[PDB]
Structure 1
Amino acid sequence: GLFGAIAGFIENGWEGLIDGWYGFRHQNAQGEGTAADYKSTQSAIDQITGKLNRLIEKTNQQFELIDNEFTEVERQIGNVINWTRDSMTEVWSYNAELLVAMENQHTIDLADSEMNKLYERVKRQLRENAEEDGTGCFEIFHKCDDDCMASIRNNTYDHSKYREEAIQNR
């Protein structure tokens, strides 16, 4: 919820979009087309995996029995052992629930961020030839074909080719 994109001004996500986290749905003369962005999908996934590899880590740290399940140890040292072990369970349990809550916050906001980095980038590409309507869409103010879309996608769309055209139309 940090950046306003996901669950903000974009109304929802696309259950038909199997091959990515982020992508494009366009409407022009020829037809309607959908394809998911690689560069930013890859980007997020990579930050998630980098989180995982950090936690799915193995501690190389060995502990032995101070205790005895078969003949109980003397009762006083038994009680110190138990009290300490319970105190560590508190620390670890708190750490566990905290780490997980925090990583989750961050993972969700990592996602809001990358969406709102796709957007703000495409916006930048199109300069003055289109407009923010505000539901995660750009109304293009010039006729455009399906090879014009692809050039936005793979980041080649030239503006000062369609500038004047789209400007009187505003």
Structure 2
Amino acid sequence: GLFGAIAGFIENGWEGMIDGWYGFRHQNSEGTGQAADLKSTQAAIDQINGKLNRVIEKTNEKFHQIEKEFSEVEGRIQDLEKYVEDTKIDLWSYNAELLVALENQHTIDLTDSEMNKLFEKTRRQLRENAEEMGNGCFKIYHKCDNACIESIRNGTYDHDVYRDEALNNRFQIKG
């Protein structure tokens, strides 16, 4: 949608991820693994619930109103009774239809945003030690075991610890 991550630079979802809406998949010299990210999953969920709650906020109650079904033909007055109600129904129907349209439109951009915000956040953290492969995967240019991967996910990764290893690997090479 607006940010182009979901159904964008990230090719497709993972039917495999059952423990959260957004997450990580890695392959390092020790193995491969997957893990949901719960902060962004919750951010996306909390916004969607908030939105949902605001829409179910109070059915207003109404008691005696006008008759809306008639069995005799009366003319002028009953035509107005019918017209007041039909123009009321088309107006509320318009509202319902425009409301879910704007809402859904926004719920897709919101979740697209969270996807991209997690991508950016991970980017910023890895500093000069990783490169973006352009499909949502970073190529980390230093030996990163499972504890290293865990620190990137739990947000405590210290880039300085690996920077000379990374920069040597990443640039130097032979050109």
Superposition TM-score, scaled by structure 2 size: 0.92
- Map of 1:32 onto structure 2: 32
Over 3 Å counting, the alpha-carbon distance change for 1:51 and 1:150 in structure 2 is same
- Map of 2:143 onto structure 1: 143
Asked if structure 2 preserves the Cα contact closer than 8 Å seen for 1:129 and 1:166, the reply is yes
Offset of 1:58 from its aligned partner?
Answer: 2.4
SS of structure 1 residue aligned to 2:33: strand
Asked if structure 2 preserves the Cα contact closer than 8 Å seen for 1:26 and 1:32, the reply is yes
Deviations 1:102-137 (A, max 9, x none): 000000000110000000001000000000110000
5+ residue gaps, structure 2, are 171-175
What does 1:11-90 align with in structure 2 at a 5 Å threshold? Answer: 11-67=11-67, 69=69, 72=72, 74-90=74-90
Deviations 1:48-92 (A, max 9, x none): 000111111222331424216476484322110101111111111
Q: Which amino acid is 2:35 matched to?
A: A
SS of structure 2 residue aligned to 1:5: coil
- Map of 1:167 onto structure 2: 167
5+ residue gaps, structure 1, are none
Asked if structure 2 preserves the Cα contact closer than 8 Å seen for 1:6 and 1:115, the reply is yes
Asked if structure 1 preserves the Cα contact closer than 8 Å seen for 2:3 and 2:113, the reply is yes
Asked if structure 1 preserves the Cα contact closer than 8 Å seen for 2:10 and 2:135, the reply is yes
Q: Could you tell me how far apart the structure 1 residues matched to 2:71 and 2:159 are?
A: 82
Deviates further, 55-64 or 100-109:
55-64
Deviates further, 114-123 or 55-64:
55-64
Q: Could you tell me how far apart the structure 1 residues matched to 2:39 and 2:81 are?
A: 54
Q: Could you tell me how far apart the structure 2 residues matched to 1:103 and 1:161 are?
A: 45
Q: Could you tell me how far apart the structure 1 residues matched to 2:68 and 2:166 are?
A: 82
Asked if structure 2 preserves the Cα contact closer than 8 Å seen for 1:67 and 1:73, the reply is no
Q: Could you tell me how far apart the structure 2 residues matched to 1:91 and 1:160 are?
A: 61
Aligned length: 170
After the TM superposition, which parts of structure 1 deviate over 6 Å for at least 4 consecutive aligned residues?
A: none
Q: Could you tell me how far apart the structure 2 residues matched to 1:53 and 1:78 are?
A: 39
Q: Which amino acid is 1:79 matched to?
A: D
- Identical residues among aligned pairs (%): 70
Over 3 Å counting, the alpha-carbon distance change for 1:120 and 1:43 in structure 2 is same
